[PDB]
Design an enzyme around this catalytic site. Structure first.
Site, PDB file in Angstrom:
ATOM      1  N   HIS A 138      64.940 -12.340  21.980  1.00  0.00           N
ATOM      2  CA  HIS A 138      64.452 -10.988  22.292  1.00  0.00           C
ATOM      3  C   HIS A 138      63.480 -11.064  23.466  1.00  0.00           C
ATOM      4  O   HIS A 138      62.769 -10.105  23.764  1.00  0.00           O
ATOM      5  CB  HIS A 138      63.734 -10.353  21.084  1.00  0.00           C
ATOM      6  CG  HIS A 138      64.619 -10.113  19.895  1.00  0.00           C
ATOM      7  ND1 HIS A 138      64.165 -10.230  18.597  1.00  0.00           N
ATOM      8  CD2 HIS A 138      65.932  -9.786  19.807  1.00  0.00           C
ATOM      9  CE1 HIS A 138      65.161  -9.996  17.761  1.00  0.00           C
ATOM     10  NE2 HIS A 138      66.244  -9.724  18.469  1.00  0.00           N
ATOM     11  N   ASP A 186      76.879  -6.553  26.917  1.00  0.00           N
ATOM     12  CA  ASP A 186      76.586  -5.646  25.830  1.00  0.00           C
ATOM     13  C   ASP A 186      77.586  -4.510  25.976  1.00  0.00           C
ATOM     14  O   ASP A 186      77.529  -3.719  26.921  1.00  0.00           O
ATOM     15  CB  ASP A 186      75.140  -5.164  25.928  1.00  0.00           C
ATOM     16  CG  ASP A 186      74.140  -6.258  25.552  1.00  0.00           C
ATOM     17  OD1 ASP A 186      72.903  -6.017  25.530  1.00  0.00           O
ATOM     18  OD2 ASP A 186      74.608  -7.383  25.265  1.00  0.00           O
ATOM     19  N   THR A 214      75.865  -5.338  14.047  1.00  0.00           N
ATOM     20  CA  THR A 214      76.693  -4.501  13.174  1.00  0.00           C
ATOM     21  C   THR A 214      77.957  -4.091  13.890  1.00  0.00           C
ATOM     22  O   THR A 214      77.878  -3.555  14.984  1.00  0.00           O
ATOM     23  CB  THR A 214      76.002  -3.205  12.762  1.00  0.00           C
ATOM     24  OG1 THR A 214      74.593  -3.428  12.602  1.00  0.00           O
ATOM     25  CG2 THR A 214      76.593  -2.721  11.437  1.00  0.00           C
ATOM     26  N   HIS A 254      77.346  -9.305  20.495  1.00  0.00           N
ATOM     27  CA  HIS A 254      77.258  -8.369  19.376  1.00  0.00           C
ATOM     28  C   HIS A 254      78.178  -7.158  19.489  1.00  0.00           C
ATOM     29  O   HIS A 254      78.984  -7.048  20.416  1.00  0.00           O
ATOM     30  CB  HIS A 254      75.818  -7.887  19.239  1.00  0.00           C
ATOM     31  CG  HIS A 254      75.127  -7.723  20.551  1.00  0.00           C
ATOM     32  ND1 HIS A 254      75.656  -6.968  21.570  1.00  0.00           N
ATOM     33  CD2 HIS A 254      74.006  -8.294  21.051  1.00  0.00           C
ATOM     34  CE1 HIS A 254      74.898  -7.089  22.643  1.00  0.00           C
ATOM     35  NE2 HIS A 254      73.890  -7.890  22.357  1.00  0.00           N
ATOM     36  N   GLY A 255      78.022  -6.253  18.523  1.00  0.00           N
ATOM     37  CA  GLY A 255      78.788  -5.019  18.466  1.00  0.00           C
ATOM     38  C   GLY A 255      78.408  -4.026  19.554  1.00  0.00           C
ATOM     39  O   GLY A 255      77.458  -4.234  20.317  1.00  0.00           O
ATOM     40  N   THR A 256      79.148  -2.924  19.606  1.00  0.00           N
ATOM     41  CA  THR A 256      78.959  -1.888  20.628  1.00  0.00           C
ATOM     42  C   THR A 256      77.751  -0.980  20.468  1.00  0.00           C
ATOM     43  O   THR A 256      77.567  -0.379  19.417  1.00  0.00           O
ATOM     44  CB  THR A 256      80.197  -1.011  20.676  1.00  0.00           C
ATOM     45  OG1 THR A 256      80.413  -0.438  19.374  1.00  0.00           O
ATOM     46  CG2 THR A 256      81.422  -1.854  21.045  1.00  0.00           C
TER      47      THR A 256
HETATM   48 MG    MG Z   1      72.624  -8.538  24.231  1.00  0.00          MG
END
Ligand code: MG
Ligand code: CA
Ligand code: CA
EC number: 4.6.1.1
Lengths: 735, 146
Positions: free
Chosen positions: A288, A430, A485, A514-516
């Site tokens: 992060h 992303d 998710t 990751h997810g959308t």
């Molecule tokens: Mg990312």
């Protein structure tokens, strides 16, 4: 778009049975060209003169060249083509007369021609050699120098072969030709006068009827869309703000096709586009830390946050660092830090981009350090020779905001395990969203189930059985320990997205982690420019949050692809406490829907915890209980409204009984609204809670017998003590 | 653990239907509460519920015996959303209303063959107020109500 508008149906058929005659004569396509050029044809009554609702001052007689021959006595006109923007052809008829002498109807054609012609082919695409050459039937090709029909006052110039040397000059002249030609190839009477004298123009208008009229009728039809359209930037012009790495995007290109589903990406900072191609892995969930765009470390997640964008923000950096440390603390062996090693090419990139300047060199404990320079004012940087590790320190005349001051140290950055080797981290892909074709989701359901569902007697159960399937195997998203998710297919797509950018030349693992963003319910963001990649392979980058919305509505939502939006969109995302906006259909249809029991009770509950005053207080005032009792009554009519048994009645009845059930509720609202002091907040609500009932019943009404207005129909009712005949009444009231 | 927004509701659930005035409700009316809150739970399923979480004799339920009983059914039927998205899916044009046109126009894509006669039979039976088109509310019912 309806091309012909017959103004006055005044006369009997004779008028009509004449206009029709007139039209069927003209070539079906000529019209489809006209209607395409946004034209409209006007057949009015005896408005001869400037009387047409569209005959006044816009673009009139400036330079008089009007009929076949040149007259201009407007007043004495029954046909006219409104020259400038849209073609607006206006005509009219008096008694029975076009027949006998067609020398009159022949103008409804030239009088027309000026219409398409100039954008018909003469000068449609441009003077196309087809018409540019055909316009050479002057006296070269054929032994037919007999064109004393269109070339009299403008082309007695047989002494000047016509081509790119002249034809431009008097285009209009060469229009009168396309006209009297059209008029002649189509005039009811003289069809051969053209075929006899001009031997080509016939074989021309003729080719036009062959399909030539279907031609422009299609180069225009297509132009129909792409002209007025959604201003994006398909092609490598966007793939540039796409941040993606061309070999990758182009890589993704194979998938959108095979599986047919829209792929939408957010912006991948430019600064790491190449860091990717270069094999640098991408930040996932575990990290992060903040990226950065200045100096050597650029595009990396500098373990040191004061070395990332938020340079100065004490608390941001103070918490920024606080986040990498844990990123490692909790996910060790997978996440940590490794020295920054700007490779070959990268150095030349942070130069033309201007991020860093490579100048003076130096000698320290035996090693060559070029010295990388950056206009920062607290950190100086140097990059080794042996290896290209990079280093910084606090200038002898400055300090670190957090209150740190240090000497030449290597720049550590974040990195994750990949085939067992801590690789530096940078921006990942992303996904903003994934739109698989509705038909693909089908190929997601296991035949035995979708089978065991449609073989149902209950039609209404069938729908469900289906919807749940469609829901289950396609709308549903579960939370994952690894990929944030997302949906199962969303996942599979995720893997094919990567193994796709891996069988190319990526050696950093995965680039789509990751997810959308559509599930980023917690900290949803709002990006203007969004990159999409249609099921066709074309690249696209929207420009606004709206355009994206508009696009998706036209090519996804509206079309046959399954899509869904961030459950947090019109609401208030907790995490960052942000309010986005996304047009929601259901909501756009609220102003007209009697609310439900629970939607009501819910709403109350809201204000109760907003003021600290409920629709009714827990006291003894028998005027309070009056109220409580009374909302419990609203929470009935409304609940009575949406009844399932409503099927055992015929449509019309439904509307009625419902309209009543509505009025029902409404009334009792009017009731409380006239009660004691109900907080001014509920005051408003109950009022808006009327607007709806009102609007709703208006609908249910103008849906069958719409003469009565809600206001009225209400007055005529008696909601005193007897309700019985009240309905019996209401009935007739709508009959 | 039901959120607070999720609790203030179940509060004005008892509140409204309580002609006795404690914060305790009976069977007959516990139903009435949920129903209005939005559920059609079998007059059979109310028995063992009120029969286990309160063998306290009386046959009532303090808010607690409720706030709990509820944070039980508030799990799988968490379909409130899936369902509202199924809805937006069929509403192929944005009018917030599902029309037989679109019902068929999508029932088909998912590989289902429907008769112009049957789609006009679903819609119909699904429409509660007669406009001749299912809205989210009508839809939500159609779906959940077993
Ligand atoms: Mg990312
Ligand atoms: Ca619709
Ligand atoms: Ca309806």
């Amino acid at each position: 778009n309806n091309l012909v508008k017959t103004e006055f149906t005044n006369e009997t058929l004779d008028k009509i049975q004449q206009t029709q005659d007139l039209l069927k004569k003209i070539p079906k396509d000529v019209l489809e060209i006209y209607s395409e050029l946004g034209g409209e044809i006007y057949f009015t009554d005896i408005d001869l003169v400037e009387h047409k609702e569209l005959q006044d001052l816009s673009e009139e007689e400036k330079n008089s060249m009007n009929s076949r021959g040149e007259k201009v006595p407007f007043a004495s006109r029954f046909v006219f083509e409104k020259k400038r923007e849209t073609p607006k052809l206006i005509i009219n008829i008096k008694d029975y007369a076009i027949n006998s002498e067609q020398s009159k109807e022949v103008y409804y054609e030239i009088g027309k021609g000026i219409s398409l012609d100039i954008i018909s082919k003469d000068k449609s695409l441009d003077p196309e050699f087809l018409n540019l050459i055909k316009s050479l039937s002057d006296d070269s090709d054929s032994s037919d120098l007999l064109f004393s029909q269109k070339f009299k006052e403008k082309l007695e110039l047989n002494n000047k072969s016509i081509d790119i040397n002249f034809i431009k000059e008097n285009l209009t002249e060469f229009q009168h030709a396309f006209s009297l030609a059209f008029s002649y190839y189509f005039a009811p009477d003289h069809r051969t006068v053209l075929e006899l004298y001009a031997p080509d123009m016939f074989e021309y208008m003729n080719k036009l009827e062959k399909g030539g009229f279907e031609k422009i009728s299609e180069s225009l039809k297509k132009e129909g869309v792409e002209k007025d359209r959604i201003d994006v930037l398909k092609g490598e012009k966007a793939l540039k703000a796409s941040g993606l790495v061309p070999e990758h995007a182009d890589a993704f290109k194979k998938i959108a096709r095979e599986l047919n589903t829209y792929i939408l990406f957010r912006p991948v900072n430019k600064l790491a586009t190449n860091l990717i191609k270069s094999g640098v892995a991408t930040k996932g969930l575990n990290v992060h830390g903040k990226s950065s765009d200045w100096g050597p470390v650029a595009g990396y997640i500098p373990f040191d946050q004061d070395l990332s964008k938020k340079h100065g923000q004490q608390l941001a950096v103070e918490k920024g660092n606080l986040e990498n440390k844990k990123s490692i603390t909790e996910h060790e062996g997978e996440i940590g830090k490794i020295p920054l090693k700007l490779d070959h090419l990268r150095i030349e990139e942070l130069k033309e981009n201007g991020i860093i300047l490579k100048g003076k060199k130096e000698i320290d404990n035996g090693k060559k350090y070029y010295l990388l320079e950056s206009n920062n004012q607290v950190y100086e940087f140097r990059i080794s020779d042996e290896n290209n590790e990079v280093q910084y320190k606090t200038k002898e005349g400055k300090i670190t905001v957090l209150g740190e001051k240090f000497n030449w140290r290597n720049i550590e950055v974040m990195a994750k395990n990949v085939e067992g080797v801590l690789k530096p981290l940078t921006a990942d892909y992303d996904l903003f969203a994934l739109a698989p074709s509705l038909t693909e989701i089908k190929k997601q359901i296991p035949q035995k189930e979708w089978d065991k569902v449609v073989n149902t007697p209950n039609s209404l159960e069938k729908q469900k059985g289906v919807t749940n399937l469609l829901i289950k195997y396609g709308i549903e998203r579960k939370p994952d320990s690894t990929k944030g998710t997302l949906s199962n297919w969303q996942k599979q797509m995720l893997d094919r997205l990567n193994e796709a950018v891996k069988y190319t030349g990526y050696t950093g693992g995965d680039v789509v982690n990751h997810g959308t963003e559509q599930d980023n319910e917690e900290f949803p963001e709002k990006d203007n420019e969004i990159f999409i990649i249609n099921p066709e392979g074309e690249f696209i980058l929207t420009k606004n949050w709206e355009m994206t919305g508009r696009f998706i509505e036209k090519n996804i939502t509206g079309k046959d692809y399954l899509y869904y939006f961030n459950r947090s969109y019109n609401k208030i995302a907790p995490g960052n406490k942000a309010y986005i906006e996304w047009t929601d259909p259901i909501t756009k249809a609220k102003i007209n829907t009697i609310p439900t029991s629970a939607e009501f009770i819910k709403n109350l509950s809201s204000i109760r915890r907003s003021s600290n005053v409920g629709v009714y207080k827990d006291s003894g005032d028998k005027d309070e209980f009056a109220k409580k009792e009374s909302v419990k009554k609203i929470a009935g009519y409304l609940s009575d409204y949406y009844n399932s048994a409503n099927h055992i009645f015929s449509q019309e009845k439904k509307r009625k009984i419902s309209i009543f059930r509505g009025i029902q509720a409404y009334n009792e609202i009017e009731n409380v609204l006239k009660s004691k002091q109900i907080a001014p907040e509920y005051k408003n609500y109950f009022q808006y809670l009327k607007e709806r009932i009102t609007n709703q019943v208006q609908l249910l009404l103008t849906h069958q017998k719409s003469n009565i207005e809600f206001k009225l129909l209400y007055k005529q009712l008696n909601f005193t003590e007897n309700e019985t005949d009240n309905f019996e009444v209401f009935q007739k009231i709508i009959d | 653990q039901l959120t607070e927004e999720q609790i203030a509701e179940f509060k004005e659930a008892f509140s409204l239907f309580d002609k006795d005035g404690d914060g305790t409700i009976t069977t007959k009316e516990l139903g009435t509460v949920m129903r209005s809150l939005g559920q059609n739970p079998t007059e059979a399923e109310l028995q063992d519920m009120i029969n286990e979480v309160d063998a306290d004799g009386n046959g009532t339920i303090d808010f607690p015996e409720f706030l709990t009983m509820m944070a039980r059914k508030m799990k799988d039927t968490d379909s409130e959303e899936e369902i509202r998205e199924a809805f937006r899916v069929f509403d192929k044009d944005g009018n917030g209303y599902i029309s037989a046109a679109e019902l068929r126009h999508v029932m088909t894509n998912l590989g289902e063959k429907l008769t112009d006669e049957e789609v006009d039979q679903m819609i119909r039976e699904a429409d509660i107020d007669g406009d001749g088109q299912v809205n989210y509310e009508e839809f939500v019912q159609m779906m959940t109500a077993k």
